[PDB]
Design an enzyme around this catalytic site. Structure first.
Site: not given
Ligand code: GTP
Ligand code: MG
Ligand code: GDP
Lengths: 54, 47, 430, 161, 427
Positions: C11, C15, C215, C245
């Site tokens: 995600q 995103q 986010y 570099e």
């Molecule tokens: N900066 C930022 N961080 C995000 C955003 N969406 C999710 N996160 C971060 O993603 C972290 C956790 O990862 P997950 O949301 O579980 O994504 P994933 O690796 O696909 O894990 P699964 O969906 O369970 O497969 C959280 O601590 C959020 O802070 C975003 O839109 N922007």
């Molecule tokens: Mg995931």
């Protein structure tokens, strides 16, 4: 793995089962039903029901 | 490599893989970033 | 001619990718459908009659986030083979996203990226985005890097990962997932940059005056750095820095590669009416602990070699005067080896804005990547959180049930210890 | 060691096979107990010839449903066994996966260390060949000088002593 | 494409499910005759989660109805949304309920089970994907408490990977609606501990107290009580149906909240609650939602969290909000109230955000908690079970159906072991 599939005792211990099996076998040889100790009848009834089913 | 004296045994000392205690980083002061002031109970009052 | 591949996983990665490709498309002048109303080809491939397609691969094991793009405006931009979606997510489980469900989609992913590299005649690196707390970001991310190491060998692999914040957390098993991914990334990555939500939140409130960010606002900030980082290959400049570099200049060893990033100026519209933000001021704003995007105080440790990148009407003399002033800071500690300690770059293209954006139209801006020993603070937090859970075996049954062998848990702990040992050894007195 | 652990796991699963039908599967249904109750109360009356009919009617019903439950028990045992079998396959899949990576680590580090020495050797071998070329050329000129020749330029003297 | 199969069993489950389909059909915009006449394209995105489409634009839910007597089925058949269900999915016997766990599990359950499983198999195999099952039943009766567990075991036999989430109602502490509940509940627990994956416990008494304290209902019928329960069941699966900034489905919830295989009983809650005439005085914001969520009075189970300690907790948010605000609030509630949260688990509070809230509200939140306080509930039933069993008493009506006395001892042994397991981890 499920507890239903796993083996289980018909009473508090297999040792009680062996004592019950001994007395049931004695009953099989013509002993009267009043020879059973009064406290002992419950386990005999459960095992007899299980072994008729078997 | 056929020598009889080799045959008896090939001992090995205790594992040279380190039995050492796990490394302790020097960077342990953390009051900079763990900042929120802890309280025993404010929002969920006593029973 | 010179090309870069962008991969987005989980995600958080995809995103962020939505915001990045908005920034790129508006910067070059391409409409979201890929047509016109230069440096285009380093990020895009051109088809006949003037339609452009990006070099990006979007992968997550659940379809909700990807289907947003498929139904969104950008659906016309991407090639449908690029958008890859799984069936059920990893449920924040490393073992699930690596062994059981990650292997289902891995070879489909590898065919597409390799296919995308054939059109890339002058590829020089990869850009990969993770969130270490997620199951797909870590479990599937570690699996993806392991193959790319043998598939492509000596090609620089750069990463942009969200590191677990000190105080703010959204997943309970988050400390478990980070350490397991730590082992894979330290050996395979050419260089991995660190960012965290907690520092970006505070930056997005103080410097940019926002009461309650989301986010979305943070994702636009990361896009600025990557755009500034790659701007040397795209537009003209008096001093150019290619991916090799940064690689040699920044890192003294193999296991000390982790930098931290910074950017300046990050100012609102009504503050820039007062603050001029000339070269001397913006260079000073970089070194403040406030502007670091990872909550680890640089004053805790010392500095190794740093790299500076300038976007705007910047003259080399002003760069030399600014760097000289920085070396006069006694609050800034440098290591006595690397007396030089700096590499500077200048480019002639100002930053790019976005409609409904948060940043100001500053005509000159600077970006910083630095190597420091202060990141040892960040790992010690992760180390302590893990030990409390594993002492009582808090969540081991979930990972064991999904194929993971328990012996990996102490090994991944052991590897993190050497990494902590290595940084303090180098940081020690000469 | 992994094979030994799997073997111990296989022994543990099959150690406790019940010798008879377990308790939960062992029970009858309504249509058997109801006929038993009517049989027992009929014989309590002086109406034995109808109680005997009920007993012979109920016996053929108990005999059916008991073996009907037997097939369900065997099917359930087989399905539980197949689940444990796919799990231990997955365990082996992880083990071959992890040690594939562990092999790759060594297979890259050792080749890199050799690659440092390989290029260094090939670098100096090229240097030696180009160095010997100048010596051969000067020797060829001196040999040709043995039959008519002209004096060449001399090297720089008086550098440092 | 993460379809969920819904099963209604017993008097209590049937009525709750009936209100539950009204709640969804309003949210998605389906007419009682199954026609779509909604207002947004987003409602049609992932309607496949709960519904099957009949050729002609008529949408049919994935519902299976189970009872031993058709008494409650006829009430649902005359219901407002009764036409929605598939007529062949109605499965019932022809015998009295008996209110007897042994009779429901053993005597009539075997005859009904073979037909019910194939009715399930039709819907389970009909769709592209299947994540888990949804069951609604009570633990004090004879039909739901007994036959629901039997179907749970069969579901675990055939589908050993899917998430078997069930919703159960626990007997009340002060006045209860059945004489022989301790027998039925203790027997039901032994099945639920091993076979299930998630169990949500709801108490009738707390539902009455919530109605009078906050909603100011002078005369709360069972319709309002089922309405309150229906909101939580809608909230949990909402992450599957609509997009969001941070998605969190069932299996994410199971991994995060459950630290050991057997401690998986949960307390539930919902916020906000519209006080009649008084909400004008209240300014609904994200911090206000957190205040109601962690308030002890809003919990639907009459077990006080303050007498125990927390292990894991999870909150969902629905509507357009700031992500920083959510992550700060979970931080604040965990930092200001340290004593109740365990030490050896940092970050005990999980969070999630979805952009589409229910109708009428601007934002809605759902709270799911796990705590040692459940030892109060199991101690309550154990003492009742113990003392009745010593006198023997009602055993006569279970022995005659073919239940042997060893099952009572085994059920108490496992139930008592569960109590100590909550005792041990408090240290
Ligand atoms: N900066 C930022 N961080 C995000 C955003 N969406 C999710 N996160 C971060 O993603 C972290 C956790 O990862 P997950 O949301 O579980 O994504 P994933 O690796 O696909 O894990 P699964 O969906 O369970 O497969 C959280 O601590 C959020 O802070 C975003 O839109 N922007
Ligand atoms: Mg995931
Ligand atoms: N919330 C709610 N609870 C109900 C309703 N109807 C019955 N119950 C509860 O369900 C419990 C047991 O129901 P019961 O009739 O024994 O269900 P059975 O298992 O099918 O026999 C009782 O304690 C009731 O309080 C209802 O409409 N709503």
């Amino acid at each position: 793995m499920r507890r239903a599939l796993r083996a289980r005792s018909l009473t508090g211990s297999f040792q009680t089962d062996r004592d019950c099996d001994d007395i049931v076998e004695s009953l099989m040889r013509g002993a009267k039903c009043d020879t059973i100790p009064p406290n002992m009848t419950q386990n005999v009834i459960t095992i007899l029901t299980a072994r008729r089913k078997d | 490599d056929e020598e009889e004296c080799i045959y008896n045994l090939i001992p090995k000392p205790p594992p040279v893989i380190v039995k050492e205690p796990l490394h302790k980083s020097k960077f342990q002061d953390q009051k900079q970033f763990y900042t929120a002031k802890k309280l025993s109970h404010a929002t969920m009052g006593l029973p | 001619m010179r090309e870069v591949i962008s991969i987005h996983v989980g995600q958080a990665g995809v995103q962020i990718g939505n915001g990045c490709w908005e920034l790129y498309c508006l910067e070059h002048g391409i409409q979201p459908d890929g047509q016109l109303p230069d440096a285009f080809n380093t990020f895009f491939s051109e088809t006949g009659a003037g339609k452009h397609v990006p070099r990006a691969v979007f992968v997550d094991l659940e379809p909700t986030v990807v289907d947003e793009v498929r139904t969104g405006t950008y659906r016309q931009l991407f090639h449908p083979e690029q958008l890859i979606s799984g069936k059920e997510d990893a449920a924040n489980n490393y073992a699930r996203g690596h062994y059981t469900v990650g292997k289902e989609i891995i070879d489909l992913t590898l065919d597409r990226i390799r296919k995308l590299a054939d059109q890339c005649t002058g590829l020089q690196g990869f850009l990969i985005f993770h969130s270490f707390g997620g199951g797909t970001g870590a479990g599937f991310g570690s699996l993806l890097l392991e193959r790319l190491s043998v598939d492509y060998g000596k090609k620089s692999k750069l990463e942009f990962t969200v590191y677990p914040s000190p105080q703010v957390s959204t997943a309970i098993v988050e400390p478990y997932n980070s350490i397991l991914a730590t082992h894979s990334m330290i050996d395979h990555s050419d260089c991995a940059f660190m960012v965290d939500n907690e520092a970006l939140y505070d930056l997005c409130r103080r410097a940019l005056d926002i009461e309650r960010p989301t986010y979305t606002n943070l994702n636009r900030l990361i896009g600025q750095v990557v755009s500034s980082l790659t701007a040397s290959l795209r537009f003209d400049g008096a001093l150019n820095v290619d991916f090799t570099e940064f690689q040699t200049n920044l890192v003294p060893y193999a296991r000390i590669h982790f930098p931290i990033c910074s950017y300046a100026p990050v100012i609102s519209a009504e503050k820039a009416y007062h603050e001029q933000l000339s070269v001397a001021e913006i260079t000073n704003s970089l070194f403040e602990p406030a502007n670091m995007m990872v909550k680890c105080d640089p004053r805790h440790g010392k500095y190794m070699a740093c790299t500076l990148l300038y976007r705007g009407d910047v003259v080399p003399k002003d760069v030399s005067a600014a760097v000289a002033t920085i070396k006069t800071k006694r609050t800034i500690q440098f290591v006595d080896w690397c007396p030089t300690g700096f590499k500077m770059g200048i480019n002639y293209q100002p930053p790019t804005v976005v409609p409904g954006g948060d940043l100001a139209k500053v005509q000159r801006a600077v970006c910083m990547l630095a190597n420091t020993t202060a990141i040892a603070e960040a790992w010690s937090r992760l180390d302590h959180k893990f030990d409390l859970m594993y002492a009582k075996r808090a969540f081991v049954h979930w990972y064991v049930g999904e194929g993971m062998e328990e012996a990996e848990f102490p090994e991944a702990r052991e590897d993190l210890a050497l990494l902590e040992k290595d940084y303090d050894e180098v940081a020690a007195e000469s | 060691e992994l094979e030994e652990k799997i073997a111990a796991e296989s022994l543990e699963y099959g150690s406790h096979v019940p010798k008879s039908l377990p308790l939960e599967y062992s029970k009858f249904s309504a249509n058997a107990l109801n006929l038993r109750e009517r049989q027992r109360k009929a014989a309590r009356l002086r109406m034995y010839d109808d109680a005997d009919n009920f007993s012979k009617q109920a016996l053929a019903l108990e005999k059916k449903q008991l073996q009907a439950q037997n097939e369900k028990f065997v099917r359930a045992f087989n399905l539980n066994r197949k689940y444990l079998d796919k799990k231990m396959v997955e365990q082996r899949e992880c083990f071959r996966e992890i040690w594939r990576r562990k092999k790759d680590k060594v297979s890259r580090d050792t080749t890199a260390e050799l690659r440092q020495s390989k290029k260094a050797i090939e670098n100096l071998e090229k240097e030696l060949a180009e160095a010997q070329a100048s010596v051969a050329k000067e020797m060829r000129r001196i040999k040709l000088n043995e039959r008519i020749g002209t004096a060449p330029v001399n090297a720089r003297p008086g550098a440092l002593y | 494409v993460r379809e969920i199969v819904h099963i209604q069993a017993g008097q209590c489950g049937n009525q709750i499910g009936a209100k539950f389909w009204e709640v969804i059909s309003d949210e998605h915009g389906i007419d009682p005759t199954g026609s779509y006449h909604g207002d947004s394209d987003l409602q049609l995105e992932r309607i496949n989660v709960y519904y099957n489409e009949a050729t002609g634009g008529k949408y049919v839910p994935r519902a299976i109805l189970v009872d031993l007597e058709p008494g409650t089925m006829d009430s649902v058949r005359a219901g407002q949304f009764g036409q929605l269900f598939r007529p062949d999915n109605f499965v019932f016997g022809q015998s009295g309920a008996g209110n007897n766990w042994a009779k429901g599990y053993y005597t009539e359950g075997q005859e009904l089970c073979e037909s019910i499983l194939d009715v399930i198999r039709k819907e389970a195999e009909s769709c592209d994907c299947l994540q888990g099952f949804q069951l609604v039943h009570s633990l004090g009766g004879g039909t739901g408490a007994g036959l629901g567990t039997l179907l749970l075991n069969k579901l675990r036999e055939e589908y050993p990977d899917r998430i078997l989430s069930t919703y159960s109602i626990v007997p009340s502490p002060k006045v209860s609606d059945t004489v022989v509940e301790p027998y039925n509940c203790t027997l039901s627990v032994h099945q639920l501990v091993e076979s299930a994956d998630e169990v949500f416990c709801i108490d009738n008494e707390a539902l009455y107290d919530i109605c009078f304290r906050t909603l100011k209902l002078t005369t709360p019928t069972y319709g309002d009580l089922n309405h309150l329960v229906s909101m939580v069941m809608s909230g949990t699966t909402c992450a599957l149906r609509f997009p969001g900034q941070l998605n969190s489905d069932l299996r994410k919830l199971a991994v995060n909240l459950v630290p050991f295989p057997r401690l998986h009983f949960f307390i539930v809650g919902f916020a906000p609650l519209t006080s009649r005439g008084s909400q004008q005085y209240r300014a609904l914001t994200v911090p206000e939602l957190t205040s109601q969520l962690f308030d002890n009075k809003n919990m639907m189970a009459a077990c006080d969290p303050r007498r125990g300690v927390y292990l894991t907790a999870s909150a969902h948010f629905r509507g357009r909000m700031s992500s920083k605000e959510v992550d700060e609030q979970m931080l604040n509630i965990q930092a200001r109230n340290t004593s109740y949260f365990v030490e050896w688990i940092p970050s005990n509070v999980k969070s999630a955000i979805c952009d589409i809230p229910p109708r009428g509200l601007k934002m809605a939140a759902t709270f799911i908690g796990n705590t040692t306080a459940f030892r109060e509930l199991f101690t309550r039933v154990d003492s009742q079970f113990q003392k009745m069993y010593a006198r023997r008493a009602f055993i006569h009506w279970y022995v005659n159906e073919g239940l042997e006395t060893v099952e009572f001892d085994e059920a108490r042994s496992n139930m008592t072991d569960l109590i100590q397991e909550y005792e041990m981890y408090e240290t």
